Design a protein around this ligand. Structure first.
Ligand SMILES: [Mg+2]
Ligand SMILES: [Mg+2]
Ligand SMILES: [Mg+2]
Ligand SMILES: [Mg+2]
Ligand SMILES: [Mg+2]
Ligand SMILES: [Mg+2]
Ligand SMILES: [Mg+2]
Ligand SMILES: [Mg+2]
Ligand SMILES: [Mg+2]
Ligand SMILES: [Mg+2]
Ligand SMILES: [Mg+2]
Ligand SMILES: [Mg+2]
Ligand SMILES: [Mg+2]
Ligand SMILES: [Mg+2]
Ligand SMILES: [Mg+2]
Ligand SMILES: [Mg+2]
Ligand SMILES: [Mg+2]
Ligand SMILES: [Mg+2]
Ligand SMILES: [Mg+2]
Ligand SMILES: [Mg+2]
Lengths: 206, 60, 70, 55, 143, 145, 67, 80, 63, 141
RNA sequence: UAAUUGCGAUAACGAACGAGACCUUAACCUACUAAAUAGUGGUGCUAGCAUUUGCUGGUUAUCCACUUCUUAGAGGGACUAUCGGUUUCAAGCCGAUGGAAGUUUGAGGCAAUAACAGGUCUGUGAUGCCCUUAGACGUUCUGGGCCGCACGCGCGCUACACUGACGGAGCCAGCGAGUCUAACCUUGGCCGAGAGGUCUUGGUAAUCUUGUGAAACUCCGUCGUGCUGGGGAUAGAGCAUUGUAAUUAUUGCUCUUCAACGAGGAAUUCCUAGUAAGCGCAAGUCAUCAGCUUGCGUUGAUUACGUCCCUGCCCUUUGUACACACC
């Protein structure tokens, strides 16, 4: 890659994959495509990032929250349940770890796996408590792609976090695990269940 | 800036409204080399109600 | 209390022959295979590295990770 | 004195705990009057001359 | 090329310096080690048991190298941590002036630090010497 | 550290100080189930006894165990400070003690009684089942007895 | 809501009324105009004014504006 | 000797609030109709060429229950 | 399973007494030239793509 | 006097001052090399400028930074801003315009506000809550 | 529209108070004036490592220069600008580009007319009237009490752990405050495990404490799901500090003792971006005592960018036998 050095030196694999490709912790942003139409737009990938940390003014306008890199939207949503409010660095590291884990199992761009599990847990339709007079039925609705992404990111991490609670297996594993079983849905995952059982009730009342 | 932060109320009733007065202290210093005459001249005059003037001496 | 705090010779031998096919090994993973608690499990992660089987691809505290040797 | 205190039965925790709690405990605000706020009790009244002299 | 200690990351250095003061034998280690606690804002003594006085000294050394002059009071405030007052909100608390002031004398009597003017202690000329040395040793394992 | 081995040499659970102790636990903490030996005390004692803390209660030679008990019930001899002790400056013979095991129960009694028997308000208050260290007794502590 | 108060619109009206030649589709010179040509006590109010006598001017050039 | 006092009349009392409060006090303390008192104060302040002026009188006057009047004229602003 | 893709072609308003729901007209991409109005759950702008899980059935008012 | 410039970077309260003189390509912060910095997870955040715009670029210059204020992260974003702002300052007075304006382009496109300082800042708290927006608790009755 | 904020309709035209303007603070100036009580580069004097120039430090003045950073004066800056969608092509609203900044730029200060038997006579040597006035309801001195404990309610703190506790190690803020006729803020040196003690010292302060080396946090180890090394109530014994006085335990330290609590029913609070939440700090109080408050900065999200369903309130319309106004 035509190596270059000056005074205080810059590491080999650092010099290397940096100036060449523009990739993640050390993972490919090329390839990596959203196998479900829609959800593109509402899932970033390219522009590429180094790590998922970004002072990104993503909230001052309604939809621009979509432009946040999906990987980092996935981390961002780890840093919650009070005790872990803030603590991005905490999350970021988990994610690094997670993707390493995911990659170990079944190869694949772990960042592409993350794509699949998200794509694969967004409820195509749901329900809402319409009135109809005191005794409320449940009107079926086709839900937004954005909500579908959001709800996916929430659903994913949560059921991981919950499983991760009170046992030896670490967050980063259960997170990976939840994603792995969700990249191609297996109904052994927290999210796929809730996804499917949200569309269950949705169907059941139309 | 000298803050003083107080409840408005003489007593205790009412939503707890708090209110902070403040006083701004501005201080300059101007270094001069002059003989005895101009000093005393320039110091007695230039007086001003509200400006506190302090003239010292020495290098220690 | 519920077992995995020692080494029972058969356990050691168990640990050598039972770690292929493990695409994943870590602290958790070792306790999971109905054996070794997080402490002596951690020791295994250094002494399986003594030579062979495990490749160190991830760094540190809490999270460990290896794969079968090549 | 203190000797009295320790010796005296009918005292200490064990005893109170075995007693039934009065209902005046779990009461209310009591309130008493407020609906009468705007109705002056003095029974007196001013008078349109005296206010006109003053004001 | 030339070398400082600023050219080496924290941990690799201080452990390399811990290993060195240990390997040495020359030190002066009070005696109440292992029986002492390093701060009132702590719960258990250090887990290095045999050692950690090196860990600190090495930590001490590097810090006083990094700057003009520091005292015992500064190291206390530096080295201290959070003390859970059990059920009552945490507050910062200073660490032990003994552990440090003895480490300061231990590194001084070994000539790695001297009682600076202005105040406190300043990195000895011979401290520089031996610090920048093992610093260079630390990058030589990386070569 | 090291993959170890051993034979049938270690037995699980092992009684000392008139109480019982689980083997398969790191010996430092194992000893704490004895009344009157917090983690700190445990820590210093084993450090004194020349025993490897990386070991469990499980291993630990019988001789090692014997030494460990020894120091515990004679702390001033085996150069343990004094401010490290649960009963400095008694209140009768003034010696410094580390009251251990089934005995700390005995001594809580002795003192408590001493107070009551002396009619001291502290005692009176102890006898009444209330809190003594001068806390508000209105809202807190309701379940209790 | 950036709805301009009366005084801003009041004054813009009057300025276009009697100084149409001089003024433009340019606030930046409309500004400088207001200094020389009008007395105001604050920068913000002058800008808030000039920006609107601008806008008013910018849509006179294509159709009249009532008032 | 280190301290020195001088008196000094003030350019128009009619534009000093504090000059006019103390006026009313002295108007009413000297037994004067209430409206008359303030309405004089307002009418002198105005004539002293102010842009506007306001006199509140709160409290209790000869009747038992308290009241409060406002006497204003001309121009005042109240904010900022 | 018949999956049906439709593109939002206008935003009509919020229904639902609550108001979390929005009325929108879409155009399916697998053969256009026909339109149906659906009810969303999450936030929507123009040019979005809804997964009509059942192709033909529409709502109007919501209480 | 060799060719040199001075620049800064600010995130929150952190301010990062950088001196970019001409030399043999050093890049040290406060007193240590840029390969340290740790945070570490965020290490690449500050490597970022050099990689965005070709590692070479730095061979004819020395680079130093010294951050005060801010916090363990506020400073990481500060120092990188100063680095890239400096690289573009230097090509403004010394190299030609088009190289400079080709550098702005590579930074602005990618970006994380490398040239442009983030405006955000703590809002004052007001009385009646532990936060600014946060209000205490009430109970009615 | 946040706004009787505007457009528009128009027997009204055109105005003022209030809103806005205004003011204060946080944002932007390699433009202006400067600074040994702020800091940068060069120079000597000098240390360490490399030596081939280099790298990293010491040196309140050994000198020269500068104002990017800090400070605060004077200016400038933004007007929702340009462009485009949308709309009675109106006030506007929405998107893109630019921009320090485009949610009233963010946050406060100020705030018309009126109402309340709101609260305060316990802040006032503000005050009417009533009461009391020497066995006093004046005042002061000694001691107790406001903390008293079957229980009901509210604001909080700490937790139930493995996004963790622990032990090393990294090491980063901002708003403040400090002693004269006095004992305030305290660096540094010793002594002590600790709390602390002792010797000195700088500061009436951008000059010294103090870079307030704050805490979450980051890193390497230990523990390994077990009421466990989570949790630290209750209690024993000892040591110190404030104070004339510490018992009903002011506070601080050490040892031991090791509770409830395994995420909390009906219910219900707060909140839209550097916000929420996590986190510590300074100031008030203060001899001694913060689990309170007022501010401060550190880390930093998820979810709306809507509606009238609940609740609250405003506006019309309408009824009134009320106007002391549905108490
Ligand atoms: Mg906490
Ligand atoms: Mg620490
Ligand atoms: Mg610290
Ligand atoms: Mg015990
Ligand atoms: Mg006005
Ligand atoms: Mg206003
Ligand atoms: Mg400047
Ligand atoms: Mg932009
Ligand atoms: Mg009343
Ligand atoms: Mg009063
Ligand atoms: Mg009380
Ligand atoms: Mg309250
Ligand atoms: Mg820690
Ligand atoms: Mg002693
Ligand atoms: Mg002095
Ligand atoms: Mg426990
Ligand atoms: Mg604990
Ligand atoms: Mg205080
Ligand atoms: Mg209070
Ligand atoms: Mg009527």
């Amino acid at each position: 890659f035509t190596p270059v050095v000056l005074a205080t030196p810059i590491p080999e694999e650092v010099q290397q994959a940096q100036t060449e490709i523009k990739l993640f912790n050390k993972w490919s942003f090329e390839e990596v495509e959203v196998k479900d139409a829609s959800l593109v737009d509402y899932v970033q990938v390219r522009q590429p990032i180094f790590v998922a940390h970004t002072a990104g003014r993503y909230a001052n306008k309604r939809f621009r929250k979509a432009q946040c890199p999906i990987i980092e939207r996935l981390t961002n949503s780890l840093m919650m349940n009070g005790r872990n409010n803030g603590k991005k660095l905490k999350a970021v590291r988990i994610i690094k770890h997670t993707l390493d884990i995911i990659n170990v199992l079944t190869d694949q761009n772990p960042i592409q796996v993350v794509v699949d599990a998200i794509t694969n847990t967004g409820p195509r339709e749901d329900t809402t408590r319409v009135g109809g007079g005191g005794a409320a039925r449940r009107q079926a609705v086709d839900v937004s792609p954005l909500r579908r992404v959001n709800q996916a990111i929430a659903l994913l991490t949560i059921g991981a976090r919950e499983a991760a609670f009170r046992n030896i297996k670490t967050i980063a594993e259960t997170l990976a695990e939840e994603l792995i079983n969700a990249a191609k849905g297996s109904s052994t995952s927290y999210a796929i269940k809730k996804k499917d059982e949200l569309e269950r009730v949705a169907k059941s009342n139309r | 800036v000298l803050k003083i932060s107080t409840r408005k109320t003489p007593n205790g009733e009412g939503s707890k409204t708090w209110e902070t007065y403040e006083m701004r202290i501005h201080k300059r210093y101007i270094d001069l080399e002059a003989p005895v005459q101009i000093v005393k001249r320039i110091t007695q005059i230039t007086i001003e109600p509200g400006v506190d003037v302090e003239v010292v001496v020495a290098s220690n | 209390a519920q077992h995995a705090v020692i080494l029972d010779q058969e356990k050691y031998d168990r640990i050598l022959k039972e770690v292929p096919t493990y695409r994943y090994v870590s602290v958790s993973v070792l306790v999971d295979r109905l054996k070794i608690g997080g402490s002596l499990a951690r020791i295994a992660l250094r002494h399986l590295e003594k030579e062979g089987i495990i490749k160190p691809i991830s760094k540190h505290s809490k999270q460990a990770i290896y794969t079968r040797a090549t | 004195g203190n000797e009295g205190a320790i010796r005296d039965k009918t005292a200490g925790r064990r005893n109170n705990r075995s007693k039934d709690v009065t209902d005046s405990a779990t009461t209310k605000k009591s309130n008493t009057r407020r609906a009468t706020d705007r109705h002056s009790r003095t029974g007196k009244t001013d008078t349109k001359k005296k206010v006109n002299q003053g004001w | 090329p030339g070398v400082s200690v600023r050219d080496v990351a924290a941990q690799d250095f201080i452990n390399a310096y811990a290993s060195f003061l240990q390997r040495q034998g020359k030190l002066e280690v009070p005696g109440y080690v292992d029986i002492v606690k390093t701060s009132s804002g702590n719960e258990m003594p250090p887990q290095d048991a045999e050692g950690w006085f090196y860990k600190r000294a090495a930590s001490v050394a590097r810090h006083i190298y990094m700057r003009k002059q520091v005292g015992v009071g500064k190291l206390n405030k530096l080295y201290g941590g959070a003390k859970s007052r059990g059920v009552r909100p945490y507050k910062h608390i200073d660490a032990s002036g003994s552990i440090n002031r003895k480490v300061l004398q231990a590194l001084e009597k070994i000539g790695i630090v001297e009682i600076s003017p202005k105040g406190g202690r300043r990195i000895s000329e011979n401290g520089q010497r031996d610090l920048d040395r093992i610093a260079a040793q630390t990058l030589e394992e990386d070569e | 550290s090291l993959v170890v081995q051993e034979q049938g040499s270690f037995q699980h659970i092992l009684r000392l100080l008139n109480t019982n102790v689980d083997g398969n636990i790191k010996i430092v903490y194992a000893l704490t189930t004895i009344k009157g030996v917090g983690r700190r005390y445990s820590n210093l004692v084993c450090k004194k006894a020349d025993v490897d803390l990386h070991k469990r209660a499980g291993e630990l030679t019988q001789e090692e165990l014997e030494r460990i008990v020894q120091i515990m019930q004679n702390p001033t001899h085996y150069k343990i400070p004094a401010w490290f002790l649960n009963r400095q400056n008694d209140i009768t013979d003034g010696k410094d003690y580390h009251t251990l095991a089934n005995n700390v129960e005995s001594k809580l009694r002795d003192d408590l009684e001493r107070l009551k028997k002396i009619r001291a308000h502290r005692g009176i208050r102890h006898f009444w089942g209330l809190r003594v260290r001068g806390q508000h007794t209105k809202t807190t502590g309701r379940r209790r007895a | 809501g950036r709805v301009r108060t009366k005084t801003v619109k009041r004054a813009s009206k009057a300025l276009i009324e009697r100084y149409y030649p001089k003024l433009t589709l340019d606030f930046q010179t409309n500004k400088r105009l207001c200094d020389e040509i009008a007395t105001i006590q604050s920068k913000r109010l002058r800008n808030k004014i000039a920006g609107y006598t601008t806008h008013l001017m910018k849509r006179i050039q294509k159709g009249p504006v009532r008032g | 000797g280190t301290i020195v006092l001088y008196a000094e009349r003030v350019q128009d009392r009619g534009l000093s609030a504090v000059a006019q409060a103390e006026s009313m006090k002295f108007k009413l303390l000297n037994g004067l109709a209430i409206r008359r008192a303030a309405y004089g104060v307002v009418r002198y302040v105005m004539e002293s060429g102010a842009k506007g002026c306001e006199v509140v009188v709160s409290g209790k006057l000869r009747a038992a229950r308290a009241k409060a009047m406002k006497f204003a004229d001309g121009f005042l602003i109240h904010s900022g | 399973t018949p999956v049906t893709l439709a593109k939002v072609i206008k935003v009509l308003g919020r229904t639902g007494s609550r108001g979390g729901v929005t009325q929108v007209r879409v155009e399916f991409l697998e053969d256009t030239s026909r339109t149906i109005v659906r009810n969303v759950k999450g936030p929507v702008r123009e040019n979005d793509i809804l997964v009509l899980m059942e192709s033909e059935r529409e709502a109007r008012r919501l209480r | 006097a060799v060719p040199s410039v001075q620049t800064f970077g600010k995130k929150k309260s952190a301010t990062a001052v950088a001196h970019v003189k001409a030399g043999k390509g050093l890049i040290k912060v406060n007193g240590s090399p840029i390969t340290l910095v740790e945070p570490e997870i965020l290490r690449f955040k500050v490597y970022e400028p050099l990689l965005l715009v070709g590692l070479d670029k730095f061979s004819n210059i020395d680079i130093r930074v010294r951050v005060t204020g801010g916090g363990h992260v506020s400073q990481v974003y500060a120092i990188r801003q100063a680095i890239a702002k400096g690289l573009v300052a230097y090509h403004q007075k010394y190299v030609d315009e088009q190289s400079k304006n080709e550098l702005k382009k590579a930074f602005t496109s990618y970006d994380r506000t490398l040239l442009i300082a983030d405006s955000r800042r703590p809002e004052p708290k007001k009385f009646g809550g532990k936060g600014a927006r946060s209000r205490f608790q009430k109970s009615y009755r």
